[model samples]
Target: AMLAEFEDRVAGIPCLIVVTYWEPYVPAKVSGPPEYCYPAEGGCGEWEVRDRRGRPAPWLERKLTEAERERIDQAVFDRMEGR
Candidate 1:
């Protein structure tokens, strides 16, 4: 419910709300939990996203944006970090 509302509020801006592996480069210091893809279970990588309207993000090609990175960290790591 909450994340959905977050989606609505940020309507046009491109974003990703996923829990994938990260090296952080000095970040997300928590006893973080894991998110699985059920039957195809294993951690994935790099800000996974869906439902695009334009040019697909060059996630692995370009420098990952700071804002999206922060947003993903806040959403996925919030509970573990007790934010």
Candidate 2:
């Protein structure tokens, strides 16, 4: 609902959507990244991006190689593992 209002507005091309306060929106079986944070006391939620018709721009995926992606993944993994 919040996004519908932004329609027709001229803006920089956005690549990612960050949804907050959505801890209750996802089910218990889900977990993803640091996008989830505990304000009341905890959390894991997947980060995602999409657009009309559901296909992503191929260039965007190629924008980062798996080696680059794994660097970020490894950093997060290390943080989660307390290293």
Candidate 3:
């Protein structure tokens, strides 16, 4: 299981958390680690941003401004790259 690493706010908007697959599933290849692909590189292009407090909040992903969305997009790539 994974947990949020951090949080922030902007323009009175909470910087909601996100979850995504760094690598898309594919046929196995005889080798070491699985093939790596990041959404930023046009690989596993999926991101799910939401809160998990058992409460209702319509301002999760659907409300992300394009600027904020791209920011998160690049951040996801940085996250994978650092690994």
Candidate 4:
């Protein structure tokens, strides 16, 4: 998957931090009744998917080109360095 490829590309990069938003970002899989739902309350669990206003979180696809990935990486780095 894209995650595997991402790991491969950033294998040797020092101080690499990968943040994966689970569940809300990617729906849960179940064979029977629905196991999890968005805006979970109590037992279901909560997520930061939606903002304070309660809206669908921005969904991003995994398939990204090399140039696109590089640009994103650079942007993240810049932000981390307080640029």
**What TM-score number comes out for model 4?**
0.28
Please give, for residues 1-83, the per-residue lDDT of candidate 1 as tens digits.
11321121123445434333533333333454545222332222343443243223455224446674565546544432333
lDDT tens digits, residue span 1-57, model 4 = 111112222223322223232222234354565655343222121122222233332
Predicted structure with the largest TM-score when compared to the true one: 3
The segments of candidate 1 whose C-alpha lies over 4 angstroms from its true place after superposition are 1-16, 20-46, 52-64, 79-83
Better of 3 and 4 by TM-score: 3
Give the TM-scores of the predictions, in the order they appear.
0.29, 0.26, 0.47, 0.28
**Each candidate: what lDDT?**
0.38, 0.33, 0.51, 0.32
Off by over 4 Å in 4: 1-59
Candidate 3 Cα outliers beyond 4 Å, as residue runs? 1-12, 24-44, 52-57
lDDT tens readout by residue for model 3, 1-83? 23223353333466544444565324434455556532232334455454555233566655768887677766665654454
lDDT of 1: 0.38
lDDT of 3 at 82: 52
- Clashing residue pairs in all predictions, respectively, total 0, 1, 0, 0
Tell how far residue 23 is off in model 1, in angstroms: 13
Per lDDT, the best of the predicted structures is 3
